[PDB]
Design an enzyme around this catalytic site. Structure first.
Site, PDB file in Angstrom:
ATOM      1  N   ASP A 234     -86.528 -88.252  39.361  1.00 26.23           N
ATOM      2  CA  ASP A 234     -85.587 -89.055  38.393  1.00 26.23           C
ATOM      3  C   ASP A 234     -84.352 -89.110  39.349  1.00 26.23           C
ATOM      4  O   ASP A 234     -84.178 -88.587  40.408  1.00 26.23           O
ATOM      5  CB  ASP A 234     -85.583 -87.952  37.195  1.00 26.23           C
TER       6      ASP A 234
ATOM      7  N   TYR B 293     -90.915 -76.707  43.160  1.00 26.51           N
ATOM      8  CA  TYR B 293     -89.455 -77.241  42.829  1.00 26.51           C
ATOM      9  C   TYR B 293     -88.402 -75.938  43.191  1.00 26.51           C
ATOM     10  O   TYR B 293     -88.859 -74.851  42.883  1.00 26.51           O
ATOM     11  CB  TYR B 293     -89.390 -77.783  41.402  1.00 26.51           C
TER      12      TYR B 293
END
Ligand SMILES: [Cl-]
Ligand SMILES: [Cl-]
Ligand SMILES: [Mg+2]
Ligand SMILES: [Mg+2]
EC number: 5.4.99.12
Lengths: 264, 264
Positions: free
Chosen positions: B51, B106
Protein backbone atom coordinates in the site's frame (compact mmCIF):
# COMPACT_ATOMS: atom_id res chain seq x y z
CA UNK A 1 4.96 48.72 26.92
CA UNK A 2 7.63 46.33 25.66
CA UNK A 3 7.32 42.54 25.73
CA UNK A 4 9.83 39.78 25.06
CA UNK A 5 8.34 36.63 23.54
CA UNK A 6 10.01 33.22 23.83
CA UNK A 7 9.37 31.18 20.70
CA UNK A 8 9.86 27.64 19.43
CA UNK A 9 9.76 26.72 15.76
CA UNK A 10 10.38 23.84 13.36
CA UNK A 11 13.16 25.30 11.23
CA UNK A 12 12.73 22.63 8.55
CA UNK A 13 9.44 24.29 7.52
CA UNK A 14 10.99 27.70 6.78
CA UNK A 15 13.67 29.41 4.71
CA UNK A 16 15.35 30.73 7.84
CA UNK A 17 14.33 33.25 10.45
CA UNK A 18 14.98 36.57 8.72
CA UNK A 19 12.23 37.84 6.43
CA UNK A 20 13.06 37.31 2.75
CA UNK A 21 11.07 38.05 -0.40
CA UNK A 22 8.90 35.32 -1.94
CA UNK A 23 9.68 32.62 0.67
CA UNK A 24 8.23 31.52 3.99
CA UNK A 25 10.28 32.64 7.01
CA UNK A 26 9.76 32.63 10.76
CA UNK A 27 9.89 36.43 11.00
CA UNK A 28 7.48 36.70 8.08
CA UNK A 29 5.15 34.20 9.76
CA UNK A 30 5.18 36.26 12.96
CA UNK A 31 4.79 39.63 11.23
CA UNK A 32 1.89 38.29 9.15
CA UNK A 33 0.12 37.01 12.28
CA UNK A 34 0.67 40.41 13.91
CA UNK A 35 -0.81 42.16 10.87
CA UNK A 36 -3.74 39.73 10.65
CA UNK A 37 -4.48 40.11 14.36
CA UNK A 38 -4.63 43.91 14.11
CA UNK A 39 -1.85 44.44 16.66
CA UNK A 40 0.04 47.68 16.09
CA UNK A 41 3.65 47.48 17.23
CA UNK A 42 7.00 49.26 17.15
CA UNK A 43 10.66 48.33 17.52
CA UNK A 44 10.49 44.66 16.53
CA UNK A 45 13.82 43.00 17.36
CA UNK A 46 15.09 39.42 17.45
CA UNK A 47 17.75 37.74 19.56
CA UNK A 48 19.06 35.44 16.82
CA UNK A 49 18.50 35.18 13.07
CA UNK A 50 18.76 31.42 12.71
CA UNK A 51 19.81 30.01 9.34
CA UNK A 52 17.58 28.05 6.99
CA UNK A 53 16.72 24.68 8.50
CA UNK A 54 17.73 25.56 12.08
CA UNK A 55 15.07 24.98 14.75
CA UNK A 56 14.50 26.69 18.09
CA UNK A 57 13.06 25.88 21.49
CA UNK A 58 13.67 29.28 23.04
CA UNK A 59 14.55 31.99 20.59
CA UNK A 60 13.37 35.43 21.71
CA UNK A 61 11.82 38.45 19.99
CA UNK A 62 10.83 41.77 21.52
CA UNK A 63 8.32 44.37 20.40
CA UNK A 64 6.55 47.40 21.85
CA UNK A 65 2.77 47.74 21.78
CA UNK A 66 -0.13 49.20 23.73
CA UNK A 67 -2.39 46.36 22.52
CA UNK A 68 -3.19 44.19 25.55
CA UNK A 69 -3.83 41.14 23.35
CA UNK A 70 -0.06 40.59 22.96
CA UNK A 71 -0.15 39.16 26.50
CA UNK A 72 -2.13 36.15 25.19
CA UNK A 73 0.20 34.31 22.76
CA UNK A 74 -2.67 32.26 21.32
CA UNK A 75 -3.83 35.41 19.52
CA UNK A 76 -0.77 34.97 17.29
CA UNK A 77 -0.27 31.19 17.59
CA UNK A 78 -3.76 30.59 16.18
CA UNK A 79 -2.58 32.52 13.09
CA UNK A 80 0.67 30.56 12.58
CA UNK A 81 1.91 27.03 11.90
CA UNK A 82 5.27 25.50 12.86
CA UNK A 83 5.96 28.48 15.19
CA UNK A 84 4.81 28.66 18.81
CA UNK A 85 5.09 31.65 21.14
CA UNK A 86 5.00 30.00 24.55
CA UNK A 87 6.58 32.50 26.97
CA UNK A 88 6.09 36.21 27.54
CA UNK A 89 7.90 38.77 29.70
CA UNK A 90 7.23 42.44 30.35
CA UNK A 91 10.54 44.26 29.84
CA UNK A 92 11.87 47.83 29.91
CA UNK A 93 11.54 49.88 26.75
CA UNK A 94 15.31 49.74 26.22
CA UNK A 95 15.30 45.92 26.27
CA UNK A 96 17.15 44.73 23.17
CA UNK A 97 17.13 40.93 22.74
CA UNK A 98 20.49 40.79 20.98
CA UNK A 99 22.36 43.20 23.27
CA UNK A 100 20.79 42.72 26.72
CA UNK A 101 23.14 40.50 28.73
CA UNK A 102 22.27 36.90 27.96
CA UNK A 103 23.47 33.33 27.67
CA UNK A 104 22.57 31.15 24.69
CA UNK A 105 22.50 27.35 24.50
CA UNK A 106 22.65 25.42 21.24
CA UNK A 107 22.23 21.68 20.81
CA UNK A 108 23.31 19.81 17.69
CA UNK A 109 21.87 16.36 16.92
CA UNK A 110 24.52 14.40 15.06
CA UNK A 111 23.83 10.83 13.86
CA UNK A 112 26.28 8.69 15.80
CA UNK A 113 26.67 5.98 13.12
CA UNK A 114 30.36 5.12 13.00
CA UNK A 115 31.39 7.84 15.48
CA UNK A 116 34.19 7.54 18.05
CA UNK A 117 32.34 9.17 20.93
CA UNK A 118 35.20 8.94 23.44
CA UNK A 119 37.59 10.80 21.15
CA UNK A 120 34.88 13.31 20.24
CA UNK A 121 34.52 14.19 23.92
CA UNK A 122 38.29 14.58 24.19
CA UNK A 123 38.36 16.88 21.16
CA UNK A 124 35.52 18.96 22.62
CA UNK A 125 37.66 20.07 25.58
CA UNK A 126 39.89 22.07 23.22
CA UNK A 127 37.05 24.50 22.42
CA UNK A 128 36.25 25.40 26.03
CA UNK A 129 37.25 28.93 26.99
CA UNK A 130 38.34 31.97 25.03
CA UNK A 131 39.79 31.49 21.54
CA UNK A 132 39.91 32.94 18.06
CA UNK A 133 36.92 31.20 16.47
CA UNK A 134 37.50 32.63 12.98
CA UNK A 135 38.54 29.21 11.65
CA UNK A 136 35.25 27.79 12.95
CA UNK A 137 32.90 30.49 11.68
CA UNK A 138 31.50 32.14 8.57
CA UNK A 139 32.94 35.65 8.63
CA UNK A 140 30.58 38.63 8.77
CA UNK A 141 32.73 41.45 10.14
CA UNK A 142 32.35 40.58 13.81
CA UNK A 143 35.29 40.20 16.18
CA UNK A 144 36.23 36.52 16.10
CA UNK A 145 37.49 36.26 19.69
CA UNK A 146 34.71 34.51 21.60
CA UNK A 147 34.33 32.43 24.76
CA UNK A 148 32.60 29.08 25.10
CA UNK A 149 31.36 28.75 28.68
CA UNK A 150 30.31 25.11 28.46
CA UNK A 151 30.53 22.29 25.93
CA UNK A 152 28.97 18.91 26.68
CA UNK A 153 28.40 15.74 24.68
CA UNK A 154 26.01 12.89 25.44
CA UNK A 155 24.33 10.05 23.59
CA UNK A 156 20.66 9.78 22.83
CA UNK A 157 19.74 6.67 20.90
CA UNK A 158 21.17 6.86 17.35
CA UNK A 159 22.63 10.37 17.76
CA UNK A 160 25.27 12.29 19.66
CA UNK A 161 24.07 15.57 21.17
CA UNK A 162 26.57 18.43 21.31
CA UNK A 163 25.51 21.20 23.70
CA UNK A 164 27.45 24.48 23.59
CA UNK A 165 26.78 27.44 25.88
CA UNK A 166 28.12 30.97 25.50
CA UNK A 167 27.23 34.63 25.61
CA UNK A 168 27.54 35.08 21.84
CA UNK A 169 28.09 32.89 18.80
CA UNK A 170 29.60 33.65 15.42
CA UNK A 171 27.82 32.73 12.20
CA UNK A 172 27.67 28.92 11.73
CA UNK A 173 29.97 28.56 14.75
CA UNK A 174 28.27 25.58 16.40
CA UNK A 175 27.87 23.68 13.13
CA UNK A 176 31.49 24.31 12.13
CA UNK A 177 32.72 23.23 15.57
CA UNK A 178 30.63 20.07 15.23
CA UNK A 179 32.26 19.26 11.89
CA UNK A 180 35.71 19.76 13.44
CA UNK A 181 34.69 17.43 16.27
CA UNK A 182 33.74 14.78 13.69
CA UNK A 183 37.04 15.17 11.83
CA UNK A 184 39.05 15.14 15.06
CA UNK A 185 37.18 12.06 16.31
CA UNK A 186 38.15 10.12 13.15
CA UNK A 187 41.85 11.06 13.32
CA UNK A 188 41.63 13.30 10.24
CA UNK A 189 42.11 16.56 12.17
CA UNK A 190 44.75 16.42 14.90
CA UNK A 191 44.17 18.05 18.27
CA UNK A 192 47.43 19.96 17.79
CA UNK A 193 46.07 21.44 14.56
CA UNK A 194 42.83 22.50 16.28
CA UNK A 195 44.85 24.26 18.99
CA UNK A 196 46.76 26.14 16.29
CA UNK A 197 43.52 27.09 14.51
CA UNK A 198 41.96 28.31 17.77
CA UNK A 199 44.98 30.61 18.11
CA UNK A 200 44.52 32.18 14.67
CA UNK A 201 46.82 29.94 12.60
CA UNK A 202 44.74 28.45 9.78
CA UNK A 203 44.16 28.80 6.05
CA UNK A 204 40.89 30.56 5.23
CA UNK A 205 40.55 28.61 1.97
CA UNK A 206 40.43 25.23 3.77
CA UNK A 207 38.08 25.95 6.67
CA UNK A 208 36.03 23.04 8.00
CA UNK A 209 32.52 23.20 6.45
CA UNK A 210 29.41 23.51 8.63
CA UNK A 211 27.46 20.44 9.67
CA UNK A 212 23.97 20.29 8.09
CA UNK A 213 21.63 22.94 9.51
CA UNK A 214 18.62 20.72 10.21
CA UNK A 215 20.43 19.16 13.18
CA UNK A 216 20.87 22.50 14.97
CA UNK A 217 18.45 23.54 17.72
CA UNK A 218 18.57 26.92 19.46
CA UNK A 219 17.81 25.47 22.87
CA UNK A 220 17.46 28.55 25.06
CA UNK A 221 18.34 32.20 25.60
CA UNK A 222 18.52 33.31 29.24
CA UNK A 223 18.43 37.05 29.97
CA UNK A 224 19.67 38.29 33.33
CA UNK A 225 16.82 39.40 35.62
CA UNK A 226 14.26 38.48 32.93
CA UNK A 227 11.77 35.66 33.46
CA UNK A 228 9.09 34.53 31.03
CA UNK A 229 5.55 33.65 32.04
CA UNK A 230 4.55 30.42 30.30
CA UNK A 231 1.25 30.15 28.38
CA UNK A 232 -0.17 26.66 28.92
CA UNK A 233 -2.58 26.80 25.98
CA UNK A 234 0.33 27.61 23.67
CA UNK A 235 2.54 24.85 25.08
CA UNK A 236 -0.27 22.30 24.66
CA UNK A 237 -0.50 23.16 20.95
CA UNK A 238 3.30 23.20 20.60
CA UNK A 239 3.51 19.81 22.32
CA UNK A 240 0.60 18.29 20.40
CA UNK A 241 2.12 19.26 17.07
CA UNK A 242 5.75 18.41 17.85
CA UNK A 243 4.77 14.94 19.11
CA UNK A 244 2.98 14.20 15.83
CA UNK A 245 6.06 14.87 13.72
CA UNK A 246 8.42 13.21 16.21
CA UNK A 247 6.40 10.03 15.80
CA UNK A 248 6.68 10.05 12.00
CA UNK A 249 10.44 10.56 12.05
CA UNK A 250 11.14 8.17 14.93
CA UNK A 251 9.31 5.42 13.04
CA UNK A 252 10.98 6.25 9.71
CA UNK A 253 14.45 6.54 11.28
CA UNK A 254 14.16 3.09 12.85
CA UNK A 255 12.87 1.58 9.60
CA UNK A 256 15.76 3.05 7.58
CA UNK A 257 18.20 1.92 10.27
CA UNK A 258 17.06 -1.70 9.92
CA UNK A 259 17.84 -1.51 6.20
CA UNK A 260 21.48 -0.56 6.88
CA UNK A 261 23.68 -3.65 6.69
CA UNK A 262 24.98 -4.71 10.10
CA UNK A 263 28.72 -4.30 9.48
CA UNK A 264 28.13 -0.67 8.47
CA UNK B 1 14.03 -17.64 -19.26
CA UNK B 2 12.28 -16.45 -16.12
CA UNK B 3 13.95 -14.43 -13.35
CA UNK B 4 12.79 -13.44 -9.89
CA UNK B 5 14.13 -10.09 -8.68
CA UNK B 6 14.38 -9.19 -4.99
CA UNK B 7 13.75 -5.48 -4.50
CA UNK B 8 13.96 -2.86 -1.76
CA UNK B 9 12.20 0.48 -1.95
CA UNK B 10 11.41 3.58 0.10
CA UNK B 11 7.62 3.44 0.14
CA UNK B 12 7.34 7.05 1.34
CA UNK B 13 8.46 8.22 -2.13
CA UNK B 14 5.64 6.46 -4.02
CA UNK B 15 1.86 6.18 -4.22
CA UNK B 16 2.02 2.46 -3.53
CA UNK B 17 3.36 -0.48 -5.49
CA UNK B 18 0.63 -1.08 -8.07
CA UNK B 19 0.76 1.06 -11.20
CA UNK B 20 -1.81 3.87 -11.13
CA UNK B 21 -2.54 6.67 -13.60
CA UNK B 22 -0.88 10.07 -13.12
CA UNK B 23 1.12 9.15 -9.98
CA UNK B 24 4.54 7.69 -9.24
CA UNK B 25 4.44 4.02 -8.21
CA UNK B 26 7.04 1.31 -7.65
CA UNK B 27 5.67 -0.87 -10.45
CA UNK B 28 5.56 2.15 -12.75
CA UNK B 29 9.15 3.00 -11.83
CA UNK B 30 10.26 -0.54 -12.67
CA UNK B 31 8.26 -0.79 -15.90
CA UNK B 32 9.59 2.58 -17.05
CA UNK B 33 13.18 1.48 -16.40
CA UNK B 34 12.49 -1.73 -18.34
CA UNK B 35 11.10 0.28 -21.25
CA UNK B 36 13.96 2.80 -21.16
CA UNK B 37 16.55 0.00 -21.05
CA UNK B 38 15.09 -1.70 -24.13
CA UNK B 39 14.41 -4.98 -22.31
CA UNK B 40 11.52 -6.91 -23.83
CA UNK B 41 9.70 -9.03 -21.28
CA UNK B 42 6.59 -11.13 -20.69
CA UNK B 43 4.54 -12.31 -17.72
CA UNK B 44 5.44 -9.59 -15.21
CA UNK B 45 4.18 -10.62 -11.76
CA UNK B 46 4.66 -9.33 -8.22
CA UNK B 47 4.64 -11.09 -4.87
CA UNK B 48 2.95 -8.28 -2.94
CA UNK B 49 1.21 -5.04 -3.92
CA UNK B 50 2.22 -2.93 -0.94
CA UNK B 51 0.00 0.00 0.00
CA UNK B 52 0.93 3.66 -0.34
CA UNK B 53 3.70 4.54 2.11
CA UNK B 54 4.76 0.94 2.84
CA UNK B 55 8.46 0.17 2.31
CA UNK B 56 10.21 -3.08 1.42
CA UNK B 57 13.56 -4.75 1.96
CA UNK B 58 12.77 -7.92 0.04
CA UNK B 59 9.68 -7.75 -2.09
CA UNK B 60 9.90 -9.93 -5.19
CA UNK B 61 8.86 -9.58 -8.83
CA UNK B 62 9.24 -12.09 -11.64
CA UNK B 63 9.40 -11.63 -15.39
CA UNK B 64 10.39 -13.64 -18.45
CA UNK B 65 12.92 -12.35 -20.97
CA UNK B 66 15.60 -13.53 -23.37
CA UNK B 67 17.56 -10.30 -22.79
CA UNK B 68 20.73 -11.23 -20.90
CA UNK B 69 21.02 -7.72 -19.41
CA UNK B 70 18.31 -8.54 -16.85
CA UNK B 71 21.00 -10.51 -14.99
CA UNK B 72 22.76 -7.21 -14.14
CA UNK B 73 20.35 -5.27 -11.89
CA UNK B 74 22.31 -2.03 -12.32
CA UNK B 75 20.89 -1.81 -15.86
CA UNK B 76 17.55 -1.01 -14.21
CA UNK B 77 18.78 0.51 -10.93
CA UNK B 78 20.67 3.21 -12.85
CA UNK B 79 17.27 4.18 -14.35
CA UNK B 80 15.38 4.36 -11.02
CA UNK B 81 15.40 6.23 -7.72
CA UNK B 82 14.15 5.02 -4.32
CA UNK B 83 13.92 1.43 -5.69
CA UNK B 84 16.82 -1.03 -5.68
CA UNK B 85 16.88 -4.47 -7.30
CA UNK B 86 19.58 -6.23 -5.31
CA UNK B 87 18.96 -9.96 -5.75
CA UNK B 88 18.26 -12.13 -8.78
CA UNK B 89 17.30 -15.79 -9.20
CA UNK B 90 16.79 -17.92 -12.28
CA UNK B 91 13.45 -19.69 -11.84
CA UNK B 92 11.20 -22.08 -13.80
CA UNK B 93 8.80 -20.57 -16.30
CA UNK B 94 5.85 -21.49 -14.08
CA UNK B 95 7.31 -19.57 -11.12
CA UNK B 96 4.60 -17.25 -9.81
CA UNK B 97 5.78 -14.96 -6.98
CA UNK B 98 2.38 -14.78 -5.28
CA UNK B 99 1.51 -18.48 -5.52
CA UNK B 100 4.85 -20.32 -5.30
CA UNK B 101 5.19 -21.61 -1.72
CA UNK B 102 6.71 -18.84 0.37
CA UNK B 103 7.00 -17.24 3.78
CA UNK B 104 6.70 -13.47 4.25
CA UNK B 105 8.05 -11.35 7.10
CA UNK B 106 6.73 -7.89 7.94
CA UNK B 107 8.17 -5.49 10.49
CA UNK B 108 6.25 -2.52 11.86
CA UNK B 109 8.11 0.38 13.50
CA UNK B 110 5.85 1.84 16.16
CA UNK B 111 6.96 4.85 18.24
CA UNK B 112 7.15 3.54 21.78
CA UNK B 113 6.31 6.85 23.50
CA UNK B 114 3.92 6.01 26.33
CA UNK B 115 3.64 2.32 25.40
CA UNK B 116 3.27 -0.56 27.87
CA UNK B 117 5.69 -2.94 26.17
CA UNK B 118 5.23 -5.82 28.61
CA UNK B 119 1.46 -5.89 28.07
CA UNK B 120 1.92 -5.47 24.31
CA UNK B 121 4.04 -8.64 24.26
CA UNK B 122 1.36 -10.45 26.26
CA UNK B 123 -1.35 -9.31 23.83
CA UNK B 124 0.77 -10.45 20.87
CA UNK B 125 0.59 -14.11 21.95
CA UNK B 126 -3.15 -14.14 21.19
CA UNK B 127 -2.51 -13.71 17.45
CA UNK B 128 -0.13 -16.66 17.10
CA UNK B 129 -1.59 -19.59 15.18
CA UNK B 130 -4.68 -20.04 13.03
CA UNK B 131 -7.59 -17.64 13.46
CA UNK B 132 -10.28 -15.74 11.63
CA UNK B 133 -8.44 -12.51 10.84
CA UNK B 134 -11.45 -10.75 9.29
CA UNK B 135 -11.71 -8.35 12.24
CA UNK B 136 -8.06 -7.40 11.69
CA UNK B 137 -8.14 -6.94 7.92
CA UNK B 138 -9.60 -4.86 5.10
CA UNK B 139 -11.90 -7.24 3.26
CA UNK B 140 -11.24 -8.00 -0.41
CA UNK B 141 -13.02 -11.30 -1.01
CA UNK B 142 -10.25 -13.56 0.28
CA UNK B 143 -10.81 -16.29 2.85
CA UNK B 144 -10.16 -14.69 6.24
CA UNK B 145 -8.83 -17.80 8.00
CA UNK B 146 -5.06 -17.34 8.14
CA UNK B 147 -2.14 -18.58 10.24
CA UNK B 148 0.55 -16.47 11.88
CA UNK B 149 3.67 -18.61 12.21
CA UNK B 150 5.66 -16.18 14.36
CA UNK B 151 5.05 -12.85 16.09
CA UNK B 152 7.87 -11.12 17.96
CA UNK B 153 8.28 -7.74 19.61
CA UNK B 154 11.49 -5.97 20.57
CA UNK B 155 12.66 -2.45 21.35
CA UNK B 156 14.92 -0.36 19.21
CA UNK B 157 15.60 3.07 20.62
CA UNK B 158 12.41 5.18 20.52
CA UNK B 159 10.30 2.52 18.77
CA UNK B 160 8.82 -0.92 19.28
CA UNK B 161 9.36 -3.32 16.38
CA UNK B 162 6.58 -5.83 15.68
CA UNK B 163 7.72 -8.70 13.46
CA UNK B 164 5.05 -11.02 12.04
CA UNK B 165 5.78 -14.06 9.88
CA UNK B 166 3.28 -16.08 7.86
CA UNK B 167 2.61 -17.71 4.52
CA UNK B 168 -0.01 -15.14 3.51
CA UNK B 169 -1.38 -11.87 4.83
CA UNK B 170 -4.75 -10.22 4.37
CA UNK B 171 -5.04 -6.59 3.30
CA UNK B 172 -3.80 -4.22 6.04
CA UNK B 173 -3.51 -7.22 8.37
CA UNK B 174 -0.21 -6.33 10.04
CA UNK B 175 -1.15 -2.68 10.53
CA UNK B 176 -4.56 -3.59 11.96
CA UNK B 177 -3.00 -6.15 14.31
CA UNK B 178 -0.53 -3.49 15.44
CA UNK B 179 -3.38 -1.10 16.27
CA UNK B 180 -5.11 -3.84 18.28
CA UNK B 181 -1.83 -4.45 20.12
CA UNK B 182 -1.69 -0.75 21.02
CA UNK B 183 -5.30 -0.73 22.25
CA UNK B 184 -4.81 -3.97 24.20
CA UNK B 185 -1.58 -2.65 25.75
CA UNK B 186 -3.42 0.42 27.11
CA UNK B 187 -6.31 -1.57 28.61
CA UNK B 188 -8.81 -0.26 26.05
CA UNK B 189 -9.23 -3.60 24.25
CA UNK B 190 -9.45 -6.62 26.55
CA UNK B 191 -7.64 -9.85 25.71
CA UNK B 192 -10.97 -11.68 26.05
CA UNK B 193 -12.47 -9.43 23.37
CA UNK B 194 -9.53 -10.09 21.02
CA UNK B 195 -10.02 -13.85 21.48
CA UNK B 196 -13.69 -13.43 20.53
CA UNK B 197 -12.78 -11.34 17.48
CA UNK B 198 -10.19 -13.91 16.35
CA UNK B 199 -13.01 -16.47 16.44
CA UNK B 200 -15.30 -14.44 14.18
CA UNK B 201 -17.33 -12.56 16.80
CA UNK B 202 -16.96 -8.84 16.08
CA UNK B 203 -18.89 -5.91 14.61
CA UNK B 204 -17.70 -4.97 11.13
CA UNK B 205 -18.66 -1.32 11.70
CA UNK B 206 -16.24 -0.93 14.65
CA UNK B 207 -13.11 -2.67 13.36
CA UNK B 208 -9.78 -1.43 14.69
CA UNK B 209 -8.25 0.99 12.14
CA UNK B 210 -4.85 0.31 10.55
CA UNK B 211 -1.70 1.80 12.01
CA UNK B 212 -0.08 4.41 9.70
CA UNK B 213 1.44 2.82 6.58
CA UNK B 214 4.83 4.54 6.68
CA UNK B 215 5.87 2.37 9.63
CA UNK B 216 5.38 -0.89 7.72
CA UNK B 217 8.34 -2.65 6.11
CA UNK B 218 8.03 -5.77 3.95
CA UNK B 219 11.14 -7.38 5.40
CA UNK B 220 11.53 -10.53 3.31
CA UNK B 221 9.86 -13.14 1.13
CA UNK B 222 11.47 -16.59 1.21
CA UNK B 223 10.58 -19.04 -1.57
CA UNK B 224 11.22 -22.74 -1.03
CA UNK B 225 14.20 -24.01 -3.06
CA UNK B 226 14.77 -20.50 -4.47
CA UNK B 227 17.92 -18.54 -3.64
CA UNK B 228 18.82 -15.08 -4.91
CA UNK B 229 22.27 -14.09 -6.10
CA UNK B 230 23.16 -10.72 -4.59
CA UNK B 231 24.48 -7.86 -6.77
CA UNK B 232 27.11 -5.96 -4.79
CA UNK B 233 27.05 -2.85 -7.00
CA UNK B 234 23.29 -2.57 -6.42
CA UNK B 235 23.58 -3.07 -2.66
CA UNK B 236 26.28 -0.39 -2.45
CA UNK B 237 23.94 2.13 -4.10
CA UNK B 238 21.00 0.95 -1.96
CA UNK B 239 23.13 1.28 1.18
CA UNK B 240 24.64 4.64 0.20
CA UNK B 241 21.22 6.15 -0.41
CA UNK B 242 19.40 4.62 2.58
CA UNK B 243 22.15 5.80 4.96
CA UNK B 244 21.76 9.38 3.73
CA UNK B 245 18.06 9.52 4.55
CA UNK B 246 18.47 7.56 7.80
CA UNK B 247 20.86 10.27 8.98
CA UNK B 248 18.40 13.09 8.26
CA UNK B 249 15.55 11.39 10.11
CA UNK B 250 17.65 10.12 13.02
CA UNK B 251 18.86 13.68 13.64
CA UNK B 252 15.39 15.20 13.23
CA UNK B 253 13.73 12.55 15.41
CA UNK B 254 16.15 13.22 18.27
CA UNK B 255 15.71 16.98 17.92
CA UNK B 256 11.91 16.71 18.04
CA UNK B 257 12.18 14.30 20.97
CA UNK B 258 14.14 16.85 23.02
CA UNK B 259 11.30 19.35 22.48
CA UNK B 260 8.75 16.98 24.06
CA UNK B 261 8.22 17.89 27.72
CA UNK B 262 9.71 15.31 30.07
CA UNK B 263 6.52 14.18 31.83
CA UNK B 264 4.99 13.32 28.45
CL1 LIG C 1 25.78 27.31 13.88
CL1 LIG D 1 -0.57 -4.35 6.66
MG1 LIG E 1 44.44 30.71 22.57
MG1 LIG F 1 -10.01 -19.77 17.06
Amino acid sequence: GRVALKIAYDGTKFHGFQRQPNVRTIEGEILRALKDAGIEFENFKSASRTDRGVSARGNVIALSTEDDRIKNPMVLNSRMSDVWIWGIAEVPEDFHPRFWANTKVYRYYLPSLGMNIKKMKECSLLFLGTHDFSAFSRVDGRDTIRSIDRIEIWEKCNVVVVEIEGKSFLWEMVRRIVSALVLCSQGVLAEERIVEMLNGKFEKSRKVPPAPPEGLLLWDIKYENVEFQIDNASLKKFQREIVERFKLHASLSALYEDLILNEQ
